[PDB]
Design a protein around this nucleic acid. Sequence first.
RNA 1: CCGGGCUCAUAACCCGG
RNA 2: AUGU
RNA 3: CCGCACAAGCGGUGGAGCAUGUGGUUUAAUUCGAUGCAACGCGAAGAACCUUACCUGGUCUUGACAUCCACGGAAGUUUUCAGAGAUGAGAAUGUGCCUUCGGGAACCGUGAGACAGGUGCUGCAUGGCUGUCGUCAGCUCGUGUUGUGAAAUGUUGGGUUAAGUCCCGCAACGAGCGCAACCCUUAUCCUUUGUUGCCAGCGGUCCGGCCGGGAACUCAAAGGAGACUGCCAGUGAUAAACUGGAGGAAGGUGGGGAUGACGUCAAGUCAUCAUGGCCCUUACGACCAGGGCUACACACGUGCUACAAUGGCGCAUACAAAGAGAAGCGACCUCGCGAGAGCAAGCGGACCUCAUAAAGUGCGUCGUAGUCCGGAUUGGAGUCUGCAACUCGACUCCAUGAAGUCGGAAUCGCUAGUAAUCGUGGAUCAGAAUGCCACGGUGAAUACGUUCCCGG
Lengths: 83, 142, 115, 211, 100, 100, 224, 127
Amino acid sequence: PRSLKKGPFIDLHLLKKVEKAVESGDKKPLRTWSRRSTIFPNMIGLTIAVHNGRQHVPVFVTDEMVGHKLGEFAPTRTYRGHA
Amino acid sequence: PRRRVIGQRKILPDPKFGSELLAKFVNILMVDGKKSTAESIVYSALETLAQRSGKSELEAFEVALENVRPTVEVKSRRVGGSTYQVPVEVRPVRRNALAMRWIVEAARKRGDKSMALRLANELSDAAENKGTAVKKREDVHR
Amino acid sequence: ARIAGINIPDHKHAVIALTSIYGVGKTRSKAILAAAGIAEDVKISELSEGQIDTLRDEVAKFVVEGDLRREISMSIKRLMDLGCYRGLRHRRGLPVRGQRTKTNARTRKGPRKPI
Amino acid sequence: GQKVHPNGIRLGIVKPWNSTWFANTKEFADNLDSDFKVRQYLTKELAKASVSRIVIERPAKSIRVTIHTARPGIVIGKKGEDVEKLRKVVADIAGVPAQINIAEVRKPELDAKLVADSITSQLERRVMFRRAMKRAVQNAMRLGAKGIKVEVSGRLGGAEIARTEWYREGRVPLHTLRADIDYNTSEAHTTYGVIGVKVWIFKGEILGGMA
Amino acid sequence: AKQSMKAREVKRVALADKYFAKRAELKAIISDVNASDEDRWNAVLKLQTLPRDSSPSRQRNRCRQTGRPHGFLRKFGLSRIKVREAAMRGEIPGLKKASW
Amino acid sequence: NQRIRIRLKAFDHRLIDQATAEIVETAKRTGAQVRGPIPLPTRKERFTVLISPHVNKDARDQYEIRTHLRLVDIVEPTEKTVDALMRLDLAAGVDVQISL
Amino acid sequence: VSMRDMLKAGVHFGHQTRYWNPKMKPFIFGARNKVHIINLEKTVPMFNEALAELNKIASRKGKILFVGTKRAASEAVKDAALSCDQFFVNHRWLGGMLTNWKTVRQSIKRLKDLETQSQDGTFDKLTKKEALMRTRELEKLENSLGGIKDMGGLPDALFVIDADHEHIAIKEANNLGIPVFAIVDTNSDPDGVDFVIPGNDDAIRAVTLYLGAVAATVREGRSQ
Amino acid sequence: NQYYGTGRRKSSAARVFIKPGNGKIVINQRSLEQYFGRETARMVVRQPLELVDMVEKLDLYITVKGGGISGQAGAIRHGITRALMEYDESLRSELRKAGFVTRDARQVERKKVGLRKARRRPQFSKR
RNA sequence: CCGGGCUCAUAACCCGG
RNA sequence: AUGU
RNA sequence: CCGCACAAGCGGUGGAGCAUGUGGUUUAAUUCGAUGCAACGCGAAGAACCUUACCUGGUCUUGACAUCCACGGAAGUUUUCAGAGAUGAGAAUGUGCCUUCGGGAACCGUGAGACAGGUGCUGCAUGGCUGUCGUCAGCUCGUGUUGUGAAAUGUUGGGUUAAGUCCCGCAACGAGCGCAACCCUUAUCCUUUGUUGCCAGCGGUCCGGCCGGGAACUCAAAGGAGACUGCCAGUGAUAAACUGGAGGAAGGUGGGGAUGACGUCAAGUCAUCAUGGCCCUUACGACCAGGGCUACACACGUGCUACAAUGGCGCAUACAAAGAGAAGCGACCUCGCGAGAGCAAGCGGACCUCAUAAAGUGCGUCGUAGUCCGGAUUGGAGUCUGCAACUCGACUCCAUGAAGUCGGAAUCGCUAGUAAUCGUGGAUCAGAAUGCCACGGUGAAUACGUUCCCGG
Ligand SMILES: [Mg+2]
Ligand SMILES: [Mg+2]
Ligand SMILES: [Mg+2]
Ligand SMILES: [Mg+2]
Ligand SMILES: [Mg+2]
Ligand SMILES: [Mg+2]
Ligand SMILES: [Mg+2]
Ligand SMILES: [Mg+2]
Ligand SMILES: [Mg+2]
Ligand SMILES: [Mg+2]
Ligand SMILES: [Mg+2]
Ligand SMILES: [Mg+2]
Ligand SMILES: [Mg+2]
Ligand SMILES: [Mg+2]
Ligand SMILES: [Mg+2]
Ligand SMILES: [Mg+2]
Ligand SMILES: [Mg+2]
Ligand SMILES: [Mg+2]
Ligand SMILES: [Mg+2]
Ligand SMILES: [Mg+2]
Ligand SMILES: [Mg+2]
Ligand SMILES: [Mg+2]
Ligand SMILES: [Mg+2]
Ligand SMILES: [Mg+2]
Ligand SMILES: [Mg+2]
Ligand SMILES: [Mg+2]
Ligand SMILES: [Mg+2]
Ligand SMILES: [Mg+2]
Ligand SMILES: [Mg+2]
Ligand SMILES: [Mg+2]
Ligand SMILES: [Mg+2]
Ligand SMILES: [Mg+2]
Ligand SMILES: [Mg+2]
Ligand SMILES: [Mg+2]
Ligand SMILES: [Mg+2]
Ligand SMILES: [Mg+2]
Ligand SMILES: [Mg+2]
Ligand SMILES: [Mg+2]
Ligand SMILES: [Mg+2]
Ligand SMILES: [Mg+2]
Ligand SMILES: [Mg+2]
Ligand SMILES: [Mg+2]
Ligand SMILES: [Mg+2]
Ligand SMILES: [Mg+2]
Ligand SMILES: [Mg+2]
Ligand SMILES: [Mg+2]
Ligand SMILES: [Mg+2]
Ligand SMILES: [Mg+2]
Ligand SMILES: [Mg+2]
Ligand SMILES: [Zn+2]
């Protein structure tokens, strides 16, 4: 995965959106397309509408998910059984 | 070949002794061009046999061979236009080859803790004419 | 003969023996033997009880069998409960690190069964 | 039963190359691209001049171009008036000072390319192909007295179903490598599409190497 | 290859050529062992802002003549089909069929 | 004292041999001292390409380019020699490198 | 040449036919020892008549082609022809030698081409095998064409050893209308010969007598 | 005085120098037995001297490079044979009859297009 | 009955379950 | 046995 | 009558796990083409973005790409805000150059059309290119010749060959396209030139061809020589040809490669390109972000590693070929258990680096076991490329140790430096080889024969 010399990664616009939201206490779901952004502790308690190729999925951040990538919580494929 | 027939490739004599039969033996034993391994095994087995019975390594080996050499075969040829299992003579060269192949086959099955030991015990059984080597010959005869 | 935990190593060379412990591979085995200052190829049998005691001390410095199993179970449970894609795959008994599922998945899916 | 290219095989045996400049890896691809553009241009301009081949060299950081045509007057112009324009523009696209030389094809009948071009031209004017083939072939012998073959393929005479047909006279020993086979092709467009043309012209045997 | 593809490729090469030095400099900062943590953080954050096509990785070689995206040879800047015809013409200096 | 070392590359062996003939003849008549033309191992590059435009795997052919090498060394570079050998011109196909 | 010379030479010999065959009748003196026998009284005149016409041909100097396919006579016909500087065939008579002479001409051209190459010595340009190969090819062409390579066209008159062995050449001669001078015996139709020579077509002594007389006739007639 | 011979086999080549002597031999500044762990090669290289029974009368200095142990052994044998014939040409007869004089020419076969190996063709798939 | 093999193939006929 |  | 056609031999496939392709199923989408041989590690010599042709959503309408007219300004540089981005909005900015002194060339913006654009349809409208029979020995013409003609002969016959190769015979004589030869490569020797390659005899040496020196040897690469049934015996129709022998590095096409006759399959490709022609122009064209091409009850093809003592593990120690390198290859030294990191010499490369070959061999150990066999799977923890490794990368360390103990009916490859087995290099390429193309090391068995088949 990403080197430690490098440090974690996040997309800037998402960072500003979340920072502004938390200062404001607006706490409305955030539309975003940044599956590759990493989760930082501050985002706990927020809600992110994450694009899944088709649609933006609601997600409720919690401290456990810290360190994961957002795309990890929005499946892009569908399946229900061949039979 | 359909057009013609061609001679059999000449094979060198073993340098240690010079018995071409031994060279053919190591060849029929060798696997994936590991000739050195094969000759090592052969020498080990030959010693552990000849110095536990018989007089001489080469002579003991040869007599052991002779005790298993076949004389007849049954493999079918379409002589009469169909797969007749006609029994015909076997060439002395072919008799030697069959004996050698049978004895080497037996040892692989014998399962002692070393291939040198398997080979030595098989060849001792052959010298004693009590072993599967003579069995294959006599089953062919039967 | 027994080391820490309910496991009797059999009476072979010590390293091979110790690997029996769930959580002790070859590397940990060599490390343990070096720490105890014991030749690796001695039989499990014939060691004084003090030597086996110091070895019992050595293995204590690692996560023991019964707790290693619990740790792994807890980790997998955490991932399962979290709901992450990787966790969702675990509950479906499917390859969990990106191998083709069209073919060559018997070790995870199990023996084939007809439609 | 596809055949090999007659010229490709005999390169370095009896046939010399059409481009004899040395280069290293960095220079190589762009040199080839430049040469490609140069030919693609000169062919566009000199269509009426009956040009056969162009050989290019790059000595001493300069490009030198030699052109083979059956009638220099059309390309040399009065007092060199337009060949100078060619020199200027080729120097421009090549990015180097340019030099031009003219060689005069003497028997346009015995050039594969000119023969094929003539045939295509006649085709575009609704000439009946068999006549063109026969006249070309017979000419070849009348002047050069050595083997020739011709093929044509396409929707001949606007026929609904395309087909191919050919005509041979004299020796054409392809499998032989000593044979100085001149070979070329050319193109013809029609209301109905495309009609290809290929030509072989034997001219005797080379003994002693190209040297 | 559609004209749009060649347009894309030429735009990519030009734009990537433009920002070469700046990207190299910011890279030098980001990878530095002793650089301050905050400086590296800022350098990483800023790199996102450059045009994505600035990166050389996004380019794809294509046949000069045809722009085909497969079967490319760097030695000639051409794809397999084109090279063969030219070779047969004998326009490539010194090239010959190989029989060793 | 000084020494001139010249390396030559080409694709035609006969042509480069002729080039060396020019070099040695001029150096001889100008009264220099010479080490004979030394052959060096010749690189050959090889390329195999798929002949068919569509899917015909296992159908293809291969080509090679051979670059030759000759070396000449001059151990009495009289000044009247030095410039004269820069007055010479070589065929387009021959690449010349001079060094001291 | 007179009757007893012909008898001593075996000119009177013939060919037994099973029972009796009328085809072999034209010059039968009779039969003895189960062999039909030729009338030499008729042998002398027609033989001399053929020679006389040949002499006239010799006085004319028109070319005489001497062709032998009957194996024993081949070297003798070659000798007789070259004694007079005339052309000869000493092998199988290739069919169409007259009707397809158009083709024969090209082989003469190519024969001379390779012979010129031999004089040039330029076979030494070739790889060793191909040099030997061209030499061998030239040898075959010399073997077959040596006897006619100087003929330049269709021959004026034909000498033939045996109508019973040269019948294809006689066929072509009748086709083109070329006079034939030949030995005729029993078992053969005489009409294939314009100036028939009655006499045995086999015996080597008879063949020697024929060839000696004919070559002497050619040279004497051309020298009048 | 001294005599020389060159030998080759597969990709190996050997230079051989021979002089009268008690019979020591050094190849690449090592003893014969040191060089080859396998003992067959020791006979292989000595067969010519055994054949002409010259073992203890000639001293040998050898150099070899390229190819493997087997090829190098063969090249040494060939070079020794040639050097012997340089020393005394009358030996040529028996040397040829022994098969030592002939230059074995067998070499590896190049890979070919569509073939996994020199001649090994891919599995046919039954169709 | 379901699957694999035999055939340019479908049937007949072989090998599992 | 059949088979555009 | 011929061919690894069968037979005689050796090793596999078909059962296991995994890599890879295809069918089916599923999906918003899983883009398109290729399906007996002759489709299935195939186009694709390399899909995280790009690529990309598919899906969702967001945007443009003379346009991303070209010419033509008007019109306005050099260009360009720097920087700010909004937005996922496309874009939009602004700031400073530039502010130039040839100018015949008119302007113009430059570029950049807007407008107007004529036009642009298409991986949209037809490989059964075509060119070009390729597979297939098959490196199979055949395919034809002219002149002549026979039959009232439709035609035949040549090209069939007896031999003999890899072969319509050759000889005899022969109403045929010849010719042309195929066959063979001319070309590259390998096996032996001679000549030429000797550095960055070479070290036999000399001198010195710390012993390093290290250096003085050598031009022998190896080797490098140009040019020569050499094999033709030439020699001998037998055989044969004195034929051709066959069999044996001598000599030679090499003997009967010495070995390998390139080279594919007339035509068959309306075989494949409109998606390399070209093109007849039909179809779409605020859209079947163009721009952008995220997704997919990698899904998963299943079926099939091609591969890779295994079920082991000819073996597994530890220690020591030998012997290659052929390639690649400038944003390149990167030593040395330092650091880390390791993938690596730091520093930094050298080399456009017989000079420097990639890069110490593995089997082998010497010592020890393991004792027939689901093992000191086998490694899949999963947890934890890291390195490196890239803006960016969730979907979806390769690699290292610890821990974990599935199935598997020689595999049914059935079926493939191979006649000698081959099979089998062991390593090394290259192209595509930021990164991503169990595929593909090359290189060497070790190195076999079997062929009675043509009856079956299979094909020709
Ligand atoms: Mg991890
Ligand atoms: Mg082809
Ligand atoms: Mg890329
Ligand atoms: Mg190089
Ligand atoms: Mg393949
Ligand atoms: Mg078989
Ligand atoms: Mg199965
Ligand atoms: Mg399987
Ligand atoms: Mg598909
Ligand atoms: Mg912004
Ligand atoms: Mg507008
Ligand atoms: Mg258009
Ligand atoms: Mg078609
Ligand atoms: Mg079709
Ligand atoms: Mg053939
Ligand atoms: Mg035949
Ligand atoms: Mg016929
Ligand atoms: Mg025929
Ligand atoms: Mg015949
Ligand atoms: Mg022929
Ligand atoms: Mg005939
Ligand atoms: Mg010394
Ligand atoms: Mg010399
Ligand atoms: Mg040479
Ligand atoms: Mg020969
Ligand atoms: Mg003879
Ligand atoms: Mg005889
Ligand atoms: Mg001999
Ligand atoms: Mg012989
Ligand atoms: Mg050859
Ligand atoms: Mg050929
Ligand atoms: Mg189709
Ligand atoms: Mg299509
Ligand atoms: Mg996209
Ligand atoms: Mg795919
Ligand atoms: Mg395997
Ligand atoms: Mg192990
Ligand atoms: Mg090395
Ligand atoms: Mg080093
Ligand atoms: Mg270290
Ligand atoms: Mg490497
Ligand atoms: Mg070992
Ligand atoms: Mg482990
Ligand atoms: Mg089990
Ligand atoms: Mg079986
Ligand atoms: Mg391998
Ligand atoms: Mg590479
Ligand atoms: Mg890569
Ligand atoms: Mg190999
Ligand atoms: Zn008579």
